[model samples]
Target chain A: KVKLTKENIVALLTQGKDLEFEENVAFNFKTFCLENLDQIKKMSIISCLTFLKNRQSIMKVIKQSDFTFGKITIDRIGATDMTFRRLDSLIRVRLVEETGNSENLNTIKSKIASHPLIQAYGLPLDDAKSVRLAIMLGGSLPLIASVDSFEMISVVLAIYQDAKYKDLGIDPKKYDTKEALGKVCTVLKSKAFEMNEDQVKKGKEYAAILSSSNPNAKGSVAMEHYSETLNKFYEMFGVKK
Target chain B: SKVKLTKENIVALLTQGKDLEFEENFKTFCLENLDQIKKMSIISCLTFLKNRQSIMKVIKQSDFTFGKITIKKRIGATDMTFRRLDSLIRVRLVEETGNSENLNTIKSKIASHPLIQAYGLPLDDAKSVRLAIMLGGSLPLIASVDSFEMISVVLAIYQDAKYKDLGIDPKKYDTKEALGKVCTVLKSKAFEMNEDQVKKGKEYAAILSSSNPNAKGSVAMEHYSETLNKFYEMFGVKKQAKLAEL
Candidate 1:
């Protein structure tokens, strides 16, 4: 057993430190990871460093039943990794119930990654999806609150691309890239963006604003541009009160 | 220990200031603040005291009698909705878009929904509203039926309450980011966050309008009017509202 001491974290993580903290502590790894990722990388804090490693052993060290705070957990091959990352408590009820019957970390995680809801939003079972899925499973909400109206819809365009590519069995990594998404935007931006007739009339210019190229942009970066583009769209389509 | 938590005493304690004790989340809220609850008037006390299994051991798949429906186990309004509608969530995008073109049709759908038929669950009260918003609901219709809690959440997390007149941007509040916020804020705010708002009424509407102007004449304003009406017999809050009648 470990107490989450900084030193113990280092010592155990350096050597497969698989231990549980004292009970009822409301610790969340996402909060802990973001808060200290910078310092941990610069100073090479042990247990923290090993804890940050991309490995499954760390999960054993922290048990799935532990206060991991999310449905999916993220770890990278090294300290600095892009890898990592509700249905409210409604979906939470399902998982908590599923936690029974010889449930294991991997078992619950499979559901989190594959649920129909996840795909509806155009995300893959990669790091970004993991982070978002964790928040849905009942972690606290600052991160979710940060996103705004426009970007949310902008990101959905990914689903449109995915619909076409997955039918053709295209490489997922290739399909998720900026260039691939940009292609769909170009084809649809002027025509409909697949919007209905009423929305199409008002939304062309706004749709045109969406970026065709966001270099190195993955899930969030694409969302920001989509939001910026969405702002333009909003002006055209917002209802008069 | 002298005061037992039997249903009779539960009523007696609320009726007269006889001390009371009990314990749980929905349950704990009642026991933790007896004196405050006493001040809420007989109507409010009875509002809870008369429920079937809101309190008590409520164990072994608490046959949760919600709204008008009874299920085998306590399940979410939305989860059950997915089962009954036999609709995959993704197709909701297309379905909602088409529904807006009609008026009474959507109202009929809401009224006749299986969840409403079985659980007496108001479509607005359940987390299902978020699903409605996610699938791109008609702003006018949503504004007609939602509660104040849903309105506040739509603003605090999802909608850009700051912009409008400009008009209410229905599209602004519908997205993955908004969806994420709705799921979480719905979880936190619905059951817990409104203790302070319990006392205040439509005045909050005047304030909400200043920041989130789009809240006007829609479910957001209606929610405020109805909830305030609950603590006191003030406004005409109903399970359903006429489509064009704000």
Candidate 2:
């Protein structure tokens, strides 16, 4: 039983920063690895990871058929890495909230930076930010309470992506670079990206603003630029009372 | 302007050998036209007091016949509600005995109490209202527990004379004061938090929200262990296994 100390907890606070105290990482690693044995087996987290690495053929099967329809199966390896790191992101947030440790938090940040998923999906924040942008477009004000909710949804989406890619026949390893992977994903699955008719009209008005900024940008890039445009459009839609 | 018969009078007349038909005829005469009865002040008082009196007399005769030790085990609404403070105390004492004999005896004692019988209708109606609230989810309809408590306190404050004298709609009283009153009541309840228990409840709610936002997923597991696992994307007894999974 490792003693939980101010120093032990203080290490995990911010990402990409040098650690003031490094020992806390081992304690967390033990909790993540040793403390939760039965759940790992039942949920099959490790088995899934192993499955992703050796069964590139099976991965391709999912990529082609399963997620192929709705969402672009981002490279399977990238999806796997992203999904694997989600727990760590959750842990980092918990520790910082509990102990306010900056360095301890950074350890996970660095882990994500080099993670295969991050290389494919962009930083957790960037992908999550895009998702937030989408949700605002989705028009549910009550759900988005804080950054915490965003983090939770990000984890949900990451795990979902992995399962999706598994059902298709694409090897996550095939995508050589992030930009190449992104373009294929953007082009192949348009339905998942299509806004409703009202959203599309608002999306076009949004496209004008974004088009001025960068006429050539596509998919979420255009959506992100014009997404807030809907908010202004809907300002007129509220009850006068 | 003529004399109107009452349940007490009818019962007394029966005791003096009056027939059930005489009771029936008088009740029928009152019911035949409620509007005409309302026009008669004597009939109104007779109707009100007669119903109230019949309940009391039935309780008295029932109590006399059943005796102190006899019981009607499942008699619903026997001495149904209490409004007077002492009658309220009597209800608790009678209920706690759990002996049908004592409960039946106290039931009549309660039903005959003048003050309690007067407010009896209102008290019983309040209980019905409480039952309705319990059946309702009280969610989306009511903001939250805090909001519900605030509303309760706000309603209660309207009953206070000091607040009423301010000559403003009682609702104009600050919501902050309503909240404060609720907080005071909550503290008085002496709610003790067992950290482990609270942590478990929070974990349960979080797990439910996460794995099953719609909550259509399986909640009833055969064992305590399986119940926890389905709710979590991953949860387990073994530290190593949990570390490896969600």
Candidate 3:
């Protein structure tokens, strides 16, 4: 049986949110491993210590950059969904197996839907629903925490718009001649980094326009403006005609 | 001709944070050429104003308030923030000093000024205008300016302080000499008028010059300088000896 303890998992989970907890965890894990390390070495296929160190660094990086960006509503719906799934995975593993408590995911999901837009990344859902949810949670947050929702909705919509229109003129077929119109989708998705770049730009512009006094009307107006402008620009056929 | 308001000019007057003095002849002078005098910067207006008799009487009857003025680099009078002035006005009872319409008229003039318009309106409403008047009449706030607003606000403070400091005591001279005494003190202490003010300080300077007409020009100037020097030192402003800048 593995000696992987609840204390060890809690140490890993708490590291990113609390600096002192992380340092303490690092020290405890090190002392435990070193004391039992020789026994581990006798039958080990890999250095678990190195693996733990790598995991800590990776989690720290993701929390600082990805989680912070996601917190602001600047993340794509698909990407945000993936991020929440990743977080849910960790929380579920820690909570279900260790504590045997099953908190309903549905309530959490609804809260995610109704919570401020900046926390859009927290509520994983389809593009249409998340974007709609984001817009409806409008207005400045009484606290600073909800400020990122406006941005979150825009970024998600930007991504959805791109994915939905990968064909017409800015088709995947233009990148290479050895392709049919319909077959280009797979090659393009697998290859073109350009699609992501376009969405990012559109998302920023969408947020900027929405923040001004005149544009603060409703979410639909923002969505409609974004869709119309993008559709007009993508009408050209030379990129893939 | 259009007047230019500058930062150095205002800093000299406001740094001391002392009540400003009026010239003896301010009332008679304002009454004599009241129309043209209104067009002058507050600094220039005071020179002619405290010299007049009637205006000095009016000033003596009023109360005053004071505060800090900060000018941001590059902004002008038109770019002045009326919001802070609003707070100052509310406290000072600027509108109660005279008919509110008089203050509103002045605000309109500032708004209509070509230079002011180039920058944008500092006080956008009748409320702002009334505040400016009260501030101008008896109390002034720390008129935070960008670049352009400095010139006008400093001048306004100089005039306001002079009027506010008027002795409300019933037995006082309330005469041109009394009014000019106020101006003389402001020049020496609050305004810190340099050679430029002494040389071209015409309106403001002339009032002090005329305050004690019985004395020599040199004597009057010396009193003006001595009083201002004492005030400047008290206000923590280092004395500068130039006047071309104003």
Candidate 4:
């Protein structure tokens, strides 16, 4: 019996080594676990590697002249279902990560908000289906800070959107009421205990990230959510209060 | 009396593809009186040239044509429609004997070119690894230019930089000053990105040019990969192996 540890599988994939299908059903499923490893455990395949598959169907997905085309879209490619999602995820995430434009920031959030595979990449947010998911994911903390761009704004938005509709034990509307936002703040503040120090640290680190994206501005275009989101966290931290 | 062109009239003329009999008078008028902008307008309206046969000839001969067999639009302007500036570009090909490594080279280095890398040696490829490489501390994600949108901004930056740096006073300025000033403003994004860190990236880029003294601004290739790696690490978007070629 060969032992197929995550290490073995990762190394195989990393080297672009060939792995025939059905040779090890156990390893295949173990690879599935790698696919889903974005949260809690803090390691995931999408975040860790690309060109993840080079098998036959992906053959059509890529072409000899893709790079030379200057730029191409997947809908413009012949990729199989497996690599299609991979390419789309990378593209979507890349565009989302480009929030520096200050122009398309919100437009991106609204366009792909419904994409099921977004968090599967690295922008892990929560369904808020439960408290822990809400507190940790709604907070938009990376499983680990270093591996992800701080592509937030959506989680709090996502949390509030889903939070409002979810019958997870609250009224549909006021779930965003004073006590509710306070609840997120409360749980968010105490994440070190409820979760761990890393989650707590991420919650606050984003505070500074947001602080950098903003200037306490009072303009029309964006100026609101980025600024308001800042105070939402700032109110909790020590301003000598 | 020879006819002259105004920017307003040229704009209206482009839409109609109408009113052009004396090519000589138009050419001579622009030569004597027009500025750089007036010339750009002439090219933009040129697709309106009644000799559709000749216009098609120009495009077929230009390096921008990728393939007669492969079926793909191969662009990135977000819209499928012909762009106003892009039309101007195709028409500009009429003046030059285009095609060669030098043409794409000038393009790849320029601030806001429509990306003519189509004319070069094919960059190497590998499996699962991103198709890219870096020079000048540039990131490895590869520059995926498709249209003039990003370049338009850069051209604006270059012109402003050129004027401010060289005085465009026509006597003291040269290409060296323009290059450094443009680089300084352009220094800096990509990948499973997030809003938070990208602001860090904007600061990464913004702090450089925004504060001025910004010659050697980030180049497109350099910043494209920089943000990709930065965003990748921040979000854990991973790629395999140390060597990625593009």
Residue A98 error for model 1, in Å? 32
All candidates: DockQ: 0.01, 0.01, 0.00, 0.01
DockQ score of the complex predicted as candidate 3:
0.00
DockQ for candidate 4, please give it.
0.01
Considering summed lDDT, which 10 consecutive residues are worst modelled in model 4 chain B? B127-136
How displaced is residue B245 in candidate 1, in Å?
Answer: 48
Q: Which 10 consecutive positions of candidate 2 chain A have the poorest summed lDDT?
A: A137-146
- The DockQ for candidate 2, computed on C-alphas, is 0.01
Find the candidate with the highest lDDT and give its number. 1
| Cα shift from native, residue B145, model 1 (Å) | 25
Evaluate all candidate structures by whole-model CA lDDT and list the values in order: 0.32, 0.29, 0.30, 0.29
Error of 3 at B238 (Å): 66
Q: Write the per-residue lDDT of candidate 1 for residues B117-233, one digit (tens) a residue.
A: 222223332223323222222222222222434443443332343334323333223334454544443453344546554433233333333331222322222333432222221
* Stretches of model 2 off by over 4 angstroms after superposition: A1-101, A124-241, B1-246
What's the TM-score of candidate 2 when only chain A is evaluated? 0.21
lDDT of 1: 0.32
Q: What does the lDDT read for residue A180 in candidate 2?
A: 28
Off by over 4 Å in 3: A1-241, B1-246
| Residue A195 miss distance in model 1 (angstroms) | 22
